[PDB]
TrEMBL record, chain B:
Gene symbol of the encoding locus: 14
Domain of life of the source: Viruses
Organism of origin: Mycobacterium phage Bxb1
Entry protein name: Major capsid protein
Localisation per UniProt entry: Virion
Regions crossing the membrane: none
Length: 99, 49
């Protein structure tokens, strides 16, 4: 829930040829990190108590599956196309510069 | 209350549920019994051809 942090190496570590006594070179490595956090997706739906008691056409059980279906499709439209992406998502596939 | 098919609430009256929740067919609780002949009850029967 608090997100995660990913470490990465980056330094161009280096070494060089020498002759006898040709006093030796010096080098330094380097490091970096990226963090990411989850977003929330939600909805509410409302009915008369008589509609709930009678459950016409199995509308309640239908809605339970249909909102689940919609929530999965909202994840793809975020990650593929950026369409409604919450700002905590990083990158989307249509954002690339190769066609 | 709310509109006949309100945009944010599901109700029994919504158009969406036509063809469900139909009223149940009862017997006729007010069936007036058939009349029948009084003449054929009082008058003397005879054979016929």
């Amino acid at each position: 829930a608090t997100g995660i942090v990913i470490p990465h190496w980056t330094g161009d570590v280096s070494a060089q040829w020498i002759g006898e006594g040709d006093m030796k070179p010096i080098t330094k490595g380097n490091m970096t990190k990226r963090d990411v956090h989850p977003a929330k997706i939600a909805t509410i739906f409302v009915a008369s108590a008589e509609t709930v008691r009678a459950n016409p056409a199995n509308y309640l059980g239908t809605m339970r599956t249909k909102v689940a279906t919609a929530i999965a499709m909202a994840f793809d439209n975020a990650a593929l196309h950026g369409t409604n992406a919450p700002s905590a998502f990083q990158g989307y596939l249509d954002q690339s510069n190769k066609t | 209350g709310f509109s006949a098919d309100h945009s944010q609430i599901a109700q029994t009256k919504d158009t969406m549920f036509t063809g469900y929740l139909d009223p149940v067919q009862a017997k006729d609780y007010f069936a007036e019994a058939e009349k029948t002949s009084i003449v054929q009850r009082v008058a003397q029967k005879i054979p016929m051809g």
